[model samples]
Target: GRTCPKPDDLPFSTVVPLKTFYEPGEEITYSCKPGYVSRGGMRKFICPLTGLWPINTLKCTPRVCPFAGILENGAVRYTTFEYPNTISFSCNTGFYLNGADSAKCTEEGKWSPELPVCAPIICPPPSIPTFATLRVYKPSAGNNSLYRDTAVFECLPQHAMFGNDTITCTTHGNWTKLPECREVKCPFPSRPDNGFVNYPAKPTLYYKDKATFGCHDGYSLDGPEEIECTKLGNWSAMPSCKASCKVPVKKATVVYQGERVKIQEKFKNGMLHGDKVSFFCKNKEKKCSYTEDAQCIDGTIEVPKCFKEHTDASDVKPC
Candidate 1:
């Protein structure tokens, strides 16, 4: 008889030698590859003298593995848990991987290696610097420092803080850089030209240090008499001494503080700003005396309009 039908004609079957011809009464075998499994199949078959191959009841099915386990604080991604499949893992924010990042199914119908785990990120407590204090917030379980925690720093009174005043735990398991505190100090004060400061000479001045000022004999202070250092490391405003004004009239008699005196002798150094003076004016018809007043403002004093050049103490009539 002629050769029997080829084994490749069977569903999902292949011949070992891949030949197109087979002798009568010849034997053939079948099996599945890694991603497939043989089901209800006769492993060996025989050709008969009639020159026709019998019907093959063999079958092939896709292979699959057991379900993969879940991870805490983490997530897994995969299309299927079947043989020759792949799976990847990742952790949530403030967490880090503690195992392999990925896994693959093997031909033996099992996952190679194992799944990964996620661990919470840790960080040390913030350190306090000189002249400063620190406070922590939102500690993790067991009162230990963890990611997303916060810290606040403050400086003592009369002192200033430098750098970041607040810091937070990072995802890399480290705290932010700490800050420093320093004493507040002011630079050398500029002295007023016409005045002297009572501040004692020192190498440096700190917060709350005071300086008093006084004017020369012929000058008056115009601003604050004393200035003190501020918390921002600077002194307050300094006062200036204004020069006194000179009386304009030479022979006229001026009344000041209820006393009448000659302008030349009584006000040789003039009067300070805002000083008031009164001149005696004679009433020709009544033969009596009346007073006219003038005020000094910013070294400029207004003279009485009724006063005359000839007017003097001798021409005044007693009230």
Candidate 2:
């Protein structure tokens, strides 16, 4: 209890005193500051039996995500906002998501574990030829399971197919290796004859191999100067040549320059080992180069002899 001063001033000028009092279980309530909300039970101080207030004070903490924003699996749903509102995100199927899943809406205004994300879906690894490209698809959110997606494999120009062109996702969240497209070389090819092959046939020519041909001397080659092999497995245009044979009069003799075969004799196949032949110089006035140049027989020039004409033919000279 407190003593009260009388209205009239006593011997000393003094200020009125405030009373200190308590009743067991008397409750004193505290309020949170503006912009802050209450937490736990009621904000209060309770008087104890010993005439003293309890030791604890009430606190106000804003909302936040689960501790450190960590989900059970180490991943949380995708989120952009902070705590309470931002913590409710998840990854799509076929992917692995990380981050906190839930938060206290009324607790401290702090975020837990920061960023959350959805990872890529698992798919088969792509396989490709020695020179091929492959690409996989990516998702925006949510964790994916394995083996639910696909990828494409392609080869550049001048390349061909060696194996499969696509890869699929597997349950293990990975893609199979994609087959590769290989390079096929097309070089200039030689032909034994006038043989031609159609497209789409299996390629058979070796690179840089020369296709050989002959023109029988009198015959002339008229086609493709040369051809070269390329990586594309295509050959150069085929070659062609022209051939012609000269006519021989009744007694005209053909001869070869070399023992092996002569260009002119080879054309007609009629040169003999021992046969006499005469050649008339186009210009009669000019003397012949050799005394026997105009007359050759048995591989030798004959001496001009007194020859008589054949009994049947006057123009035919007899030997």
Candidate 3:
């Protein structure tokens, strides 16, 4: 009955094994846990004669670990770095983590694993295609390229570019969409009806090729004589041929040009369009000779009904 009960309610522990009872004037020493630290307090307790252990002042707080938030091109997120605390790391845009993503403070005041680094993403070297070449004005120093870097391409003379020539590197460790250079070819030039064309003999026509057109004997050219291939895969403006006109009268006296002549066999092949002619007409009542005008229109000419080969003898002396 003269012994004191164990100090079970105290926050500290002692290395020495403990018994259920302790005599008066007996002393015990206390210390912090493995991962804890001491904060200015009494570390010794003594049992009193009234069968009770006298209280002592002592503090045990979690140990603080060294700084672990130093990062480059990265961000660290954590509330604290003390024992049992963890800090997470993240890389900035166009960068990727090169090591552990998170770290925790261990019992020995050291962070577990290791800190990570944010490295720039790398892209493969840009290549030149057969139809295009690189615009090396501001060429990259090395074979590889980093994120956000750019490159330009130049299409060949016989090719046309389809999309934007400039391309940039992306954070996915690849380059952006690359443009394509397609060969520019034009369709074969065509000749108008009743016409023949003269052009270089080639199975496939390309841009800037030229063709000359000529009309047949009975037709005339209506537009430019030459046409060229264009970049839109088609030929330039084409020319058409127009036909000549022929008179219907087999035997008659008609005024040709500004002279009075008999149109018996003057035109065998026919006259060109817009040619004018005047035919001699007879007024039976007055016995007078007059002229009626006629024009050739596109392969046809109409003779006046009043015109006749009779009433000869200088046609009554020109009325």
* Candidate 3 ranges with C-alpha deviation above 4 Å: 1-34, 39-49, 136-144, 160-164, 177-184, 189-204, 207-319
- C-alpha local distance difference test of each model: 0.76, 0.43, 0.75
Q: Against the true structure, candidate 3 has what lDDT?
A: 0.75
Which of the two, 2 or 3, has more lDDT? 3
Q: Candidate 1, clashing residue pairs?
A: none
Assess every candidate by TM-score. Answer: 0.56, 0.25, 0.51
Q: Looking at model 2, report the run of 10 residues with the lowest lDDT sum.
A: 6-15
Cα distance off (Å), candidate 2, residue 263: 31
Ten contiguous residues minimizing lDDT sum, candidate 1: 9-18
lDDT of 2 by residue, 175-232 (tens): 6655756566664344423333223234554333335444443343445545544445
Q: How large an RMSD does model 3 have?
A: 16.7
Cα lDDT tens digits, model 1, 146-264, are 78788888887667777888887888777788788889898877777777877758788877778888887777887888898876787788778777778877777778878877777
- lDDT digits (tens) for residues 1-319 of candidate 3: 5888776644533533466788887876677767777776437767778887665566777788888777899899989889879999999987899999999888788888777889978887877766899985243536688788888899887676777898888888777888888777876666678889888888877666788999899877666788877657777877777777765677676778778666656666676666778888777778777788887766777777776654452345566
Q: If both were scored by TM-score, which would come out higher, candidate 2 or candidate 3?
A: 3
**Compared to the true structure, candidate 1 yields what TM-score?**
0.56
